[PDB]
Design a protein around this ligand. Structure first.
Ligand SMILES: *[C@@H]1O[C@H](CO)[C@@H](O[C@@H]2O[C@H](CO)[C@@H](O[C@@H]3O[C@H](CO)[C@@H](O)[C@H](O[C@H]4O[C@H](CO)[C@@H](O)[C@H](O)[C@@H]4O)[C@@H]3O)[C@H](O)[C@H]2NC(C)=O)[C@H](O)[C@H]1NC(C)=O
Ligand SMILES: *[C@@H]1O[C@H](CO)[C@@H](O[C@@H]2O[C@H](CO)[C@@H](O[C@@H]3O[C@H](CO)[C@@H](O)[C@H](O)[C@@H]3O)[C@H](O)[C@H]2NC(C)=O)[C@H](O)[C@H]1NC(C)=O
Ligand SMILES: *[C@@H]1O[C@H](CO)[C@@H](O[C@@H]2O[C@H](CO)[C@@H](O)[C@H](O)[C@H]2NC(C)=O)[C@H](O)[C@H]1NC(C)=O
Ligand SMILES: *[C@@H]1O[C@H](CO)[C@@H](O[C@@H]2O[C@H](CO)[C@@H](O)[C@H](O)[C@H]2NC(C)=O)[C@H](O)[C@H]1NC(C)=O
Ligand SMILES: *[C@@H]1O[C@H](CO)[C@@H](O[C@@H]2O[C@H](CO)[C@@H](O)[C@H](O)[C@H]2NC(C)=O)[C@H](O)[C@H]1NC(C)=O
Ligand SMILES: *[C@@H]1O[C@H](CO)[C@@H](O)[C@H](O)[C@H]1NC(C)=O
Ligand SMILES: *[C@@H]1O[C@H](CO)[C@@H](O)[C@H](O)[C@H]1NC(C)=O
Ligand SMILES: *[C@@H]1O[C@H](CO)[C@@H](O)[C@H](O)[C@H]1NC(C)=O
Ligand SMILES: *[C@@H]1O[C@H](CO)[C@@H](O)[C@H](O)[C@H]1NC(C)=O
Lengths: 719, 717
């Protein structure tokens, strides 16, 4: 009874899921690192294991990032890692020679003790590239000097191979704007032109004598957007670079490139998207020429579905598999696998649907061409989980679940990765149990062995109370939505508990999920006897498009009304205390958390909001415009979704606004603007701001934040 | 209902009504603002004219008014935007006193403009205005303007207006130009910030993409503004002559801490070395540029009040100035000096006209037609200020004027004499709710009263509003006041909470007869908290000896005193050691912080606004004055900081309030503090106001007071 979960535990190194950082190399050798922190080669044939790196990635300035060369003769360490946006990190690199020790500084020519925007490795051999001053550099091997592939790079204006903010956070959802041809002969990359894009300033108060902060291109709602070209260079000899032109329909009009991928060692598929995000064009490009052939096109009456989807091919290209929406009847559309048959030049490709039901095919993992099978992740088995399924491409059109019996009750939510010949696959658990990675043979899920058990962490949460989350199911409109109630160790049916209602932090995400998670609220629960509640309302993703697009043009309108009807039901329970009800949400969820805190009725005694996005006119183009469309251009519906005007009350409501000053996603401006109206409106509120922090606070401050929130919620909830 | 509540202080009943009195002739005084009306008064006939009416509303809430010399026009400032402290930037309009019609005041080619400065001249209707750091001149309402300087460059080269360092630290006002008595000539400062490092004031609250400014702000030991003093003639050619520095200062770092006209040609410019230990009074013939060394000063610590303005013979045979005199043990005090000017470089016999342990604060006037000179002095009492006259040529006698005005109701004064000195304005400011009055010189018949602050008087009358017991403490060889402001109903029995308020800038005086009403008065009345002020060493206006006890030990001394004062406070029966709180802002936030460390924890909670937390991060001319140069000559700078060795603030409940746009104490100070405070794991609470200054706007304001009030009241329970 004195073995329960305290905040500083979450920072204990016992917890903190240990990720195997598994990676394929041959169809034999998997490079998964990090059991004890050791990088390891494993031959799945012989079981033979080699120690590549040891507890060394300490010794060189706390190297936080590791990558093993293709030829397995070297390791690339990143140390001095500095955050930038989300996936963007800028650090210094070093090269450990796997066979003998000796480490090199990785520097651009003429430059010493340097800092790089990106490093990684290539595909063939020991080749690697690194980005510096927004220019791409290439080293054919450890031997040779580097080769600057682009001179066009200009700091904070023209980017090469790395994403500017808009492309990283919104469009691409990763900072890697370049891609390697399968044979390492060729490199495709994005040239992003921010010349005309308006810039926002991230201030720095904490530096030297006179601190100076940066200014980056950040197009706001309806603003000038980054123009962008897609080039391709050949890494052998001449380095002739060819721009791959857009589809003729998009030529001259505003557009984004939301994906590109290699199919052959020459052809690539670049998905183009209009600024409005209602029109998709899949193009296939011959890189030796620049021949660009319209292949498939899509449209929406609201906004286009997952834009990063990557199609699988015949490796010749006779056929290819992709996921698209199918009307499915009433109950809306669901993403299902498509059979498109590419031919004969000859536009037109026959489409055959390989899947259907009310559930989604999330990702298409692999196509095993030697047989009749294709592999994917699906909610079929259950909307709350994810499972690994195979269907037979050519054939009966049948379907079968693989992951279903792995843990039974202990793994309901998966992800997986197949070897390059698809002969076997890695199965990440992430399920209700403390996550476990495992390596199976394809044709025979004998489960073989287990790569990572997260052992220490398992026994850690075992000791602690750690209850089971009752799940109620609500009917809103025509839908059925999950309400997850996480309840204190000892639960009297009798008493009146305090209720924390946590918001989904970005739209189209899924709160209630079998995915294992441990975090602050778990502490709020156990100590402090608070029940935390999550409810996935309309707009929450991963069930149908119909729930997902219920948000279009009404933002904060719908999600809020649902969150409230969910509190309503919550309210009619005996064991929750209407007197003490609190809300929490961050980012966008801070936005909705705020909308909920206005005049409808006051169901909340106190609530706390972190990096709240408070006015959509002030948020990023590709985000606002997606849901609300263009601003003063076509719509004043933008005035409607704001926290800023009409603050008309937050009454006895106790409000806590937490914001990072250096935040690059939700600018501090959002809370500044809010706080301003909040004063002129005469509303009781309390704020905590972290000088020079981001949307995600550093390790230093973070604990302080949790402590803050924890104290806040626990204290206000007291009777 | 009959005690003082916060929102009263914002009630327009309160808010001292300032007459904004101003002389014109030796007859007509222009004091405005009784009902908000601008008024001419003929002190001969009593005749009053209404110049302006309840119109300075109608034109966009005009916040600022000035009447032309010839009394035919009024200059309104509206759209007033704060800049630093005295610096305001607004749009101007010209009301024609005789016939209403109003003009836009614009630089040529510019429409609906915004100006850095306007005011008026001396002779006639002439006026000048500053735009893009250039000086413009209008000989009259008729004529087009005349650009007197093209050298102006935004936030780099300033003309006639002070950059931050000169406004806040050196000059203590933003007016860098001065008019010759006859309006023939204009002297002004050219401030060159080219090489001075710049600090950024961020703006989060603006339009789509807010952009904040960046101004030259030399920090401790940094590059400083270079500056020249030119003079232009406002008639014809506009030949402009630079007035060269003293030869000794030539080529070395220096400030100009004052300039004033003496004749319609000669000026006295006081020069100061960067170190602030050497003064040179120079007198300059403007038609030539002849610059003659007159008097020089030195200190072993730092030079005394630098804005002192000397009075002359109007010929220049003699002149009066205030300087320190050794006075014996007990230190030095500023007393009036008789310097006799006669031919060439230096000499000039010095005769001291005053002495004792007390100071001559300001020398107001010299009546040349008789044997008298006029000044303000602490003679009558260190806590007050009185208006004294001494006989220059003669017995060397002294007599107090203000002594019997209010007896017990006015002990603290200031005054202004008419141009011929024939009669004077006496501002009360004393213990009673301030009252301005107009007296005849040779006969203080008190004549009449200009401003009674009537409504305000009856306002505080109704409310409880107690009397401040004053204890006197012995520290070292000195005797220092401790003012205890006590709740309406005071039991000798109970244990009260104690708020200890800090003096906000060094060399100021907390305990003073000067009337004041503010938040703490509310803290007192409602919430039964006793607020305490104690003027320790370094506090000004008694001797230099108390004042300079700070040199090179900053936060060292003031703190030890503030504590020994808490000690004594602690031994009282009726104060509760359990509940003790501290408050201080700006610099006082600095000391408030030093007190909150390790010595012992005598405080349960304390609150700090725009704390200056590291002197290396404060302004050059401030830090360097007390602590001298930085890594240049001293690491004693490491000593005075809050930043390292936050070693504890224990159960201490701390509230840090800071404006984001603050241009005096940068937000950096609290950012820096807050940083260490987290890595040190200390419990603290913060409230920051986006886009506010060192002085919060009206909007936020109230919210701040509420905060502080709640904080202090709640923690003390
Ligand atoms: C405010 O102060 C600044 C700094 O003192 C001042 O800028 C400088 O002004 C002087 C004016 O003469 C310049 O001095 C030189 O004049 C002759 C031209 O005949 C040249 O020989 C010089 O060549 C170089 O001198 C410097 C040597 O390092 C260089 O830094 C400089 O950029 C020249 O290349 C030079 O022209 C001087 O150039 C500037 N720059 C600086 C930083 O001193 C400015 O004029 C002042 N504003 C006013 C009106 O007071
Ligand atoms: C990214 O976009 C910027 C937008 O500013 C591009 O800058 C553009 O550069 C071109 C040529 O450098 C400019 O054209 C001009 O034409 C005249 C006539 O010959 C010539 O005198 C100028 O020197 C210049 O060449 C153009 O005005 C300018 N602006 C625009 C709107 O494009 C930049 O080229 C782009 N970068 C890349 C590599 O895509
Ligand atoms: C470096 O890795 C080795 C194993 O490769 C670790 O050595 C173990 O240390 C633990 C202490 O936690 C001992 O209980 C074991 O006996 C050691 N060996 C084995 C086989 O586990 C070592 O912990 C690693 N260094 C760290 C912690 O960074
Ligand atoms: C995709 O959405 C955009 C919204 O930006 C549509 O934009 C058109 O813009 C004009 C501008 O005046 C409007 O008059 C039209 O009504 C809009 N068309 C609509 C509503 O669709 C764009 O046409 C859309 N296209 C598709 C394929 O849906
Ligand atoms: C005024 O004080 C400053 C220092 O506060 C003196 O500056 C001198 O600076 C040099 C720099 O290396 C030192 O070596 C000297 O010790 C300083 N002189 C001293 C002791 O004062 C400056 O000389 C002082 N001048 C006067 C007139 O007192
Ligand atoms: C290698 O190790 C694993 C560990 O359980 C085992 O399952 C596997 O059978 C071994 N190798 C073989 C026989 O394939
Ligand atoms: C704000 O809070 C303070 C104290 O909690 C309270 O005195 C005041 O009534 C509140 N203001 C309003 C109008 O709610
Ligand atoms: C205008 O003055 C009159 C009397 O002179 C007064 O009653 C009135 O209050 C004044 N102005 C305003 C702001 O009402
Ligand atoms: C004007 O009135 C004042 C106020 O009572 C009085 O002192 C003065 O003698 C009067 N002067 C004349 C000349 O009317």
């Amino acid at each position: 009874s004195e073995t329960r979960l305290s905040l500083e535990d979450l920072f204990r190194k016992d917890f903190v899921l240990h990720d195997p950082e598994a990676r394929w190399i041959n169809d034999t050798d998997v490079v998964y690192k990090s059991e004890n922190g050791h990088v390891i080669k494993l031959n799945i044939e012989t079981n033979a294991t080699t120690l590549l790196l040891e507890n060394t990635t300490f010794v060189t300035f706390k190297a936080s990032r590791h990558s093993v060369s293709p030829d397995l003769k070297y390791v690339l360490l990143a140390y001095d890692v500095k955050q930038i946006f989300h996936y963007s990190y800028t650090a210094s690199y070093v090269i450990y020679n796997i066979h003998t020790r000796e480490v090199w500084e990785l520097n651009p020519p003429e430059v010493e003790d340097s800092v790089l925007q990106y490093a990684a490795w290539g595909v063939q051999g020991q080749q690697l590239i690194y980005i510096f001053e927004n220019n791409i550099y290439y080293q054919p091997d450890i031997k040779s000097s580097s080769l600057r592939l682009t001179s066009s790079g200009k700091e904070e204006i023209i980017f090469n191979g790395i994403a500017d903010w808009l492309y990283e956070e919104e469009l691409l959802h990763s900072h890697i704007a370049h891609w390697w041809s399968p044979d390492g002969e060729r490199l495709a990359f994005l040239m992003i032109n921010d010349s005309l894009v308006p810039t926002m300033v991230i201030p720095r108060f904490t530096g030297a004598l006179y601190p100076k902060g940066k200014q980056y291109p950040y197009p706001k709602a309806g603003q000038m957007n980054p123009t962008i070209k897609l080039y391709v260079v050949n890494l052998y000899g001449p380095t002739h670079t060819l721009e791959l032109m857009p589809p003729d329909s998009f030529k001259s009009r505003e557009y984004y490139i939301t994906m590109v991928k290699w199919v052959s060692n020459t052809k690539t598929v670049v998905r183009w998207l209009n600024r409005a995000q209602n029109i998709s064009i899949l193009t296939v490009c011959e890189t030796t020429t620049g021949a660009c052939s319209k292949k498939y096109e899509m449209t929406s009456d609201t906004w286009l579905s997952q834009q990063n989807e990557e199609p699988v091919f015949s490796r010749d290209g006779s056929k290819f598999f992709m996921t698209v929406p199918v009307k499915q009847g009433g109950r809306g559309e669901f993403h299902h696998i498509a059979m498109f048959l590419i031919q004969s030049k000859s536009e037109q490709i026959t489409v055959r649907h390989l899947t259907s039901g009310n559930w989604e095919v999330i990702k298409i993992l692999a196509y095993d061409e030697t047989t009749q099978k294709i592999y994917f992740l699906s909610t079929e088995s259950s909307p709350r989980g994810r499972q690994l399924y195979s269907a037979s491409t050519e054939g009966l059109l049948n379907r079968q679940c693989i992951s279903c019996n792995f843990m039974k009750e202990q793994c309901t939510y998966f992800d997986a990765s197949f070897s390059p010949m698809n002969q076997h696959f890695l199965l990440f658990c992430e399920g209700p149990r403390v996550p476990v990675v495992s390596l199976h043979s394809t044709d025979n899920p004998a489960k073989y062995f287990i790569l990572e058990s997260n052992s220490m962490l398992k026994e850690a949460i075992l000791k602690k109370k750690i209850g089971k989350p009752e799940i109620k199911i609500l009917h809103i409109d025509d839908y059925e939505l999950p309400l997850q109630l996480s309840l204190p160790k000892d639960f009297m049916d009798r008493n009146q508990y305090a209720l924390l209602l946590i918001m989904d932090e970005e739209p189209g995400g899924q709160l209630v999920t079998d995915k294992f998670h441990i975090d602050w609220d778990s502490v709020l629960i156990d100590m402090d006897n608070v029940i935390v509640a999550r409810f996935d309302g309309r707009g929450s993703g991963f069930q149908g498009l119909k729930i997902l697009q219920e948000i279009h043009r009404r933002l904060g309108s719908v999600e809020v009304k649902d969150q409230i009807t969910a509190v309503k039901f919550l309210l009619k329970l005996p064991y929750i205390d209407s007197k003490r009800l609190s809300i929490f949400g961050k980012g966008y969820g801070g936005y909705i958390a705020s909308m909920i805190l206005k005049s409808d009725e006051k169901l909340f005694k106190c609530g706390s909001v972190v990096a709240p996005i408070t006015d959509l006119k002030l948020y990023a183009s590709a985000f606002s415009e997606r849901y609300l469309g263009m601003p003063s251009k076509e719509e004043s519906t933008y005035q409607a979704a704001s926290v800023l005007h009409n603050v008309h009350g937050l009454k006895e409501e106790n409000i806590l606004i937490i914001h990072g000053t250096a935040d690059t996603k939700v600018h501090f401006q959002h809370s500044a603007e809010l706080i301003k109206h909040l004063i002129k409106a005469g509303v009781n509120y309390t704020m905590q701001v972290y000088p020079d922090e981001g949307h995600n606070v550093s390790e230093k401050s973070k604990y302080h934040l949790y402590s803050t929130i924890l104290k806040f919620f626990s204290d206000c909830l007291k009777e």
